[PDB]
Design a protein around this ligand. Sequence first.
Ligand code: MN
Length: 187
Amino acid sequence: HMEGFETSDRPGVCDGKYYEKIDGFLSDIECDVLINAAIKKGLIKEQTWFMPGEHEVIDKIQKKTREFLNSKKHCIDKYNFEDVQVARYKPGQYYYHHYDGDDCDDACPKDQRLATLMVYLKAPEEGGGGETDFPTLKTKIKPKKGTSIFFWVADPVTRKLYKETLHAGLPVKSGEKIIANQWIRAV
Ligand SMILES: [Mn+2]
């Protein structure tokens, strides 16, 4: 994603899509139900995690993530789900651009994280910033309650990172932001 010409002999990404967005992945009500469950697990002191079968909304997240990945069997085959994390962000918080996987070359972990499906459970207020930043792809995503972002982290074949999906949550300027992260590992 450079205006100036640069030759590119890098590996391709599934269907040429580094990220995909789905509105209404969860309903507003489902988001609030899950936020409240996470608060009761000690979210606010900021992150907490769920077991499979602990919560119905979490179970829906994994269910629908699998259904999405069923449509990508030409790109991925065997994979494993991590437990779902719920995390909160508020103004004046430290942030940093990173990859969700191991930045490896010849020694890639067999259980590399291959992708991430994140769900915005609560969005910042008006003029609240807190965008998801993909600086290398030169795009941000405005949080929206109920919306999911799926993005690739590593090549299922080589397990090397897609450096294109370097990302951060930018500072929240007003209100708060809560997300659920579903990480997807190779087997
Ligand atoms: Mn991340």
